[PDB]
């Protein structure tokens, strides 16, 4: 009764709107271009399954179609905002050693979790035997660098696919987006691009949590009166 | 129970079938969001394979009409003294300025390409742009 | 009315630069580790140089310097590999310090 009404007016309401959290204003094509998102690796480093996302090659350097990047980023931010709205656990995973400090700071500010260190085997497929029998697995994993330090796909995406955990991942011109739920074709090496991604995701999570509190407080006030 | 077969369908397809069969008593938190806003491509594991035979990558090079002008100015008159400032979105190098003047004279309608190149050099000399040929 | 991605790419300074070989650019130092200047320019990757032996003390963080780029990214395909091994860095020569 009351619980069903609570769920309908709070959880099911944003699902009826195309952009309930208004993430379109966060980013634009020119903003991505100024952040060097379109840049990619060499044509010899190009990986299969990224050709549709690659706009072309400019002097043995791949260029990513920012039109597709904007659409994929819009879907990824919308999914991230809804998960944050639903009190979901968001984990930022990145094996890059240049932005580990920045990503951990982002997790602290947004209230979510991060994993920028060596990924020990069994952190997801065998989490109960390590953390504890009643551990709660993350409801969403965001990859800022899907490749490990040996230029190969990370094991976390495969583990997340095994555990049915949706993944939002930044994929460059040498990544494998086959098992990534929301691939965002962009640049994972430019500091400006990484900072832009952190700010956009942090803003989306923060807005979602604030709007969840506002809607819940309004619903309680309406219930009282 | 769940399913850990990451190579058999997507996470959504496996979850939907398990819920339909009743194996999963409760749907996950992300199920409703995924259904409402599905991604452009459903994530399904596909093995990459090598392109044998005459197959070639569909990725094509990026070229423009002004690339001929840039190559010619990089060969004759060499690189400009001004250092490229790629931080500035509105940076204009000597080669780019030569290209713009060449394009403007082309818009005027000069026929000879050699005369067009010479006139572009004359315009830069009139404007005061330093033109130090390598040879 | 809205600028298209093709228009942005066509008029981008990196596109009109042409080949990166023997081109003078301006970089900015953002990280120093044991006489290693991690200079950053308007590219995908940074370039690591050594502090000059002559008046190298002025090379600090935020200093703008002049570089002669040789390659935007050092990738090479070796024997038996199916892809080009990359160092995730560019190649450049530290000419001096930009002065206004």
């Amino acid at each position: 009764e009351d619980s069903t009404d609570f769920n309908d007016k709070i959880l099911n309401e944003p699902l009826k709107h195309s952009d309930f959290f208004n993430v379109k204003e966060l980013f634009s094509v020119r903003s991505l271009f100024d952040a060097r998102v379109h840049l990619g690796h060499k044509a010899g480093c190009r990986h299969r399954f990224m050709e549709p996302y690659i706009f072309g090659s400019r002097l043995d350097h791949d260029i990513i179609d920012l039109e597709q990047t904007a659409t994929h980023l819009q879907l990824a931010l919308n999914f991230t905002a809804h998960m944050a709205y639903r009190k979901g656990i968001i984990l930022f995973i990145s094996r890059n050693r240049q932005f580990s400090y920045l990503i951990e700071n982002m997790a602290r500010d947004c209230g979510e979790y991060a994993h920028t260190r060596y990924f020990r085997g069994g952190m997801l497929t065998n989490a109960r035997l390590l953390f504890g029998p009643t551990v709660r697995l993350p409801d969403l994993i965001i990859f800022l660098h899907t490749l490990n330090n040996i230029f190969e796909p990370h094991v976390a995406v495969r583990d997340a696919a095994k555990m049915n955990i949706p993944t939002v991942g930044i994929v460059d011109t040498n990544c494998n987006p086959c098992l990534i739920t929301y691939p965002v074709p962009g640049n994972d090496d430019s500091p400006l691009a990484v900072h832009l991604y952190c700010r956009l995701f942090q803003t989306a999570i923060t807005r979602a949590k604030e709007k969840r509190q506002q809607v819940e407080a309004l619903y309680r006030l309406q219930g009282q009166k | 129970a769940g399913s850990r077969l990451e190579t058999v369908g997507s996470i959504f397809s496996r979850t939907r079938d398990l819920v339909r069969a009743g194996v999963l008593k409760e749907k996950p938190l992300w199920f409703d969001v995924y259904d409402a806003f599905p991604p452009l491509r459903e994530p399904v594991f596909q093995r990459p394979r090598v392109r044998y035979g005459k197959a070639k990558a569909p990725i094509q090079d990026i070229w423009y009409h002004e690339d001929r002008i840039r190559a010619k100015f990089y060969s004759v008159y060499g690189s400009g003294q001004r250092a490229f400032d790629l931080f500035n979105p509105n940076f204009k190098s000597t080669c780019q300025r030569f290209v713009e003047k060449y394009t403007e004279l082309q818009k005027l309608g000069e026929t000879d390409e050699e005369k067009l190149f010479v006139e572009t050099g004359k315009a830069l000399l009139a404007e005061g742009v330093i033109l130090r040929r390598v040879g | 009315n809205v600028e298209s991605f093709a228009s942005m790419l066509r008029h981008s300074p990196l596109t009109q630069m042409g080949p990166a070989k023997d081109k003078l650019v301006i970089g900015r130092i953002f990280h120093i580790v044991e006489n290693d200047l991690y200079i950053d320019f308007g590219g995908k990757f940074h370039c690591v140089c050594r502090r000059p032996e002559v008046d190298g003390e002025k090379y600090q963080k935020g200093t703008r310097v002049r570089l002669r780029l040789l390659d935007l990214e050092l990738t090479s395909r070796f024997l038996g590999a199916t892809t080009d091994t990359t160092v995730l860095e560019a190649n450049a020569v530290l000419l001096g310090i930009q002065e206004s």
Partner: peptide, 26 residues
């Protein structure tokens, strides 16, 4: 449509093929 789309061209920056010191000499 749009005139800013890349066109199909051969590489204009391509350097000429290198020749040996005895090329063209009997």
């Amino acid at each position: 449509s749009n005139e800013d789309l890349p066109i199909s061209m051969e590489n204009p920056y391509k350097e000429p093929l290198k020749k040996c010191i005895l090329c063209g000499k009997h």
